[PDB]
């Protein structure tokens, strides 16, 4: 492990997000910032909000520069709005550099901040193409690489605890690592396998085959990537296109048929509980996603356990039962490999070589009988046809 200063610099959990400490302005203002590979703006709370105990105070920063431009960011379940500017930014448990970066000072929001998440802003790590208002607003990572000698690569080890963390525990617990400019070999086991970044906007990838307990879902592979497949630390669940979700849920139900679960469970709305320590992991299947390899006609697979796709939640009665929600849900916007999937792996965002690496995480939750896996190669034909075109 050659990046000790950055190891264990994340906190949080899949449901509320994983965050890294950052500083903004002169003198430095410390904020906790959501690590989001699914967006491209660096945006921070800059006005009082009921869910924020701190926020960016531009009037207190001598290095603040006003860009005299507003930004309006609506998304499916809410929105944020703010004022654009630039300031000096650092990552205390990061590279030892300070950069001048764009900052959207959030002045108004709806269902953006999450009560008790402990973060006050978001770090959009994807590409300029999806930055708001447009691609002229340089993302943080682009600024960092341009201004310093930091290599154009970052890697994420998101560590799910495998059980619920209360308010005190989640603040005191290590949630993982964000390695800026490198790969830390202590964070994974086995080999790193790489899939191409199809296009630089979201971190888009191509899924070529899906299995549930080794059984091929047998859908036309274009369905798996309709209308895109992305790697997103800012999404909790593994989200699948409607038809893929319907086929996967049918297969997962069939594999786990020895126990009947309510419709609300499969809809990802309701929790299910078992007496302490009796979760029947073995009845649930493993899920393998095959990804396009770097070599022509070659693929590899990543395999997750129910310890990844069943998200630990506290019981309504804070009982001694072990409870979970089903963290696979449908999408009308393509596949999303969210935090519950990323929790199984060390994920290398190799922007320099336009590729994403996956290896079994040193912190993935498993049992004595099964582990997550990253394996290959497999001979896979016409993988280009798996990609969707509008
Ligand atoms: C799926 N997803 C995401 N990865 N980041 C969010 C986002 C952020 C900025 C602009 C559009 C979407 C997000 C993250 C945290 C809270 C709210 C929204 C979002 O909705």
Swiss-Prot record:
It is found in: Cell membrane; Golgi apparatus, trans-Golgi network; Endoplasmic reticulum; Endosome. Expressed at high levels in the brain and pancreas. In the brain, expression is highest in the substantia nigra, locus coruleus and medulla oblongata. Monomer. Interacts with RTN1; RTN2; RTN3 and RTN4; the interaction leads to inhibition of amyloid precursor protein processing. Interacts with SNX6. Interacts with PCSK9. Interacts with NAT8 and NAT8B. Interacts with BIN1. Interacts (via extracellular domain) with ADAM10 (via extracellular domain). Interacts with SORL1; this interaction may affect binding with APP and hence reduce APP cleavage. Interacts with NRDC AND NRG1. Residues 1-390 are extracellular. The chain holds residues 58 to 447 of 501 of the full protein. Disulfide bonds join 159-363, 221-386, 273-323. This is Beta-secretase 1. The active site is at 36, 232. One of its GO terms (molecular function) is protein serine/threonine kinase binding. It comes from Homo sapiens (Human). Keywords: Acetylation, Aspartyl protease, Cell membrane, Cell projection, Cytoplasmic vesicle, Disulfide bond, Endoplasmic reticulum, Endosome, Glycoprotein, Golgi apparatus, Hydrolase, Isopeptide bond, Lipoprotein, Lysosome, Membrane, Palmitate, Phosphoprotein, Protease, Signal, Transmembrane, Transmembrane helix, Ubl conjugation, Zymogen. It catalyses: Broad endopeptidase specificity. Cleaves Glu-Val-Asn-Leu-|-Asp-Ala-Glu-Phe in the Swedish variant of Alzheimer's amyloid precursor protein. Residues 18-359 form the Peptidase A1 domain. GO terms for biological process: amyloid fibril formation; amyloid precursor protein catabolic process; amyloid-beta formation; amyloid-beta metabolic process; cellular response to amyloid-beta; cellular response to copper ion; cellular response to manganese ion; detection of mechanical stimulus involved in sensory perception of pain. Glycans are attached at residues 96, 115, 166, 297. Inhibited by RTN3 and RTN4. Belongs to the peptidase A1 family. Its EC number is 3.4.23.46. One of its GO terms (cellular component) is plasma membrane.
């Amino acid at each position: 492990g050659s990046f000790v200063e950055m190891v264990d610099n994340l906190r949080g959990k899949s449901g509320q997000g994983y965050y890294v400490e950052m500083t903004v302005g002169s003198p430095p203002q410390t904020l906790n910032i959501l690590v989001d590979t699914g967006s491209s703006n660096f945006a921070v709370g800059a006005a009082p909000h009921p869910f924020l105990h701190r926020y960016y105070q531009r009037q207190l920063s001598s290095t603040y520069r006003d860009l005299r431009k507003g930004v309006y960011v609506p998304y499916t379940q809410g929105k944020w709005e703010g004022e654009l500017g630039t300031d000096l930014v650092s990552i205390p448990h990061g590279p030892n550099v300070t950069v001048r970066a764009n900052i959207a000072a959030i002045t108004e929001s709806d269902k953006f901040f999450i009560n008790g998440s402990n973060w006050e802003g978001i770090l959009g790590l994807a590409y300029a193409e999806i930055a708001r208002p447009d691609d002229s607003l340089e993302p943080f990572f682009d600024s960092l690489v341009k201004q310093t000698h930091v290599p154009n690569l970052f890697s994420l080890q998101l560590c799910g605890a495998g059980f619920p963390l209360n308010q005190s525990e989640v603040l005191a617990s290590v949630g993982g690592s964000m390695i800026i400019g490198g790969i830390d070999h202590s964070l994974y086991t086995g080999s790193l396998w790489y899939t191409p970044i199809r296009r630089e906007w979201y971190y888009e990838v191509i899924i070529v085959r899906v299995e549930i307990n080794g059984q091929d879902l047998k859908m036309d592979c274009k369905e798996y990537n309709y209308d895109k497949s992305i790697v997103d630390s800012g999404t909790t669940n593994l989200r699948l296109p409607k038809k893929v979700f319907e086929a996967a849920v049918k297969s997962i139900k069939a594999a786990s048929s020895t126990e009947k679960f309510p419709d609300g469970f499969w809809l990802g709305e309701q929790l299910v509980c078992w007496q302490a320590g009796t979760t029947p992991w073995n009845i649930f299947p493993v899920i393998s996603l095959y990804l396009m390899g770097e070599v022509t006609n070659q693929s590899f697979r990543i395999t997750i356990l129910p310890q990844q796709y069943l998200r630990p939640v506290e019981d309504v009665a804070t009982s001694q039962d072990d409870c979970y929600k089903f963290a696979i849900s449908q999408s009308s916007t393509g596949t999303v490999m969210g935090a519950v999937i990323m929790e199984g792996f060390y994920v290398v965002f190799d922007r320099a070589r336009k590729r994403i690496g996956f290896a079994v995480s040193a912190c993935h939750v498993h049992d004595e009988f099964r582990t997550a896996a990253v394996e290959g190669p497999f001979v896979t034909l016409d993988m280009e046809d798996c990609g969707y075109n509008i």
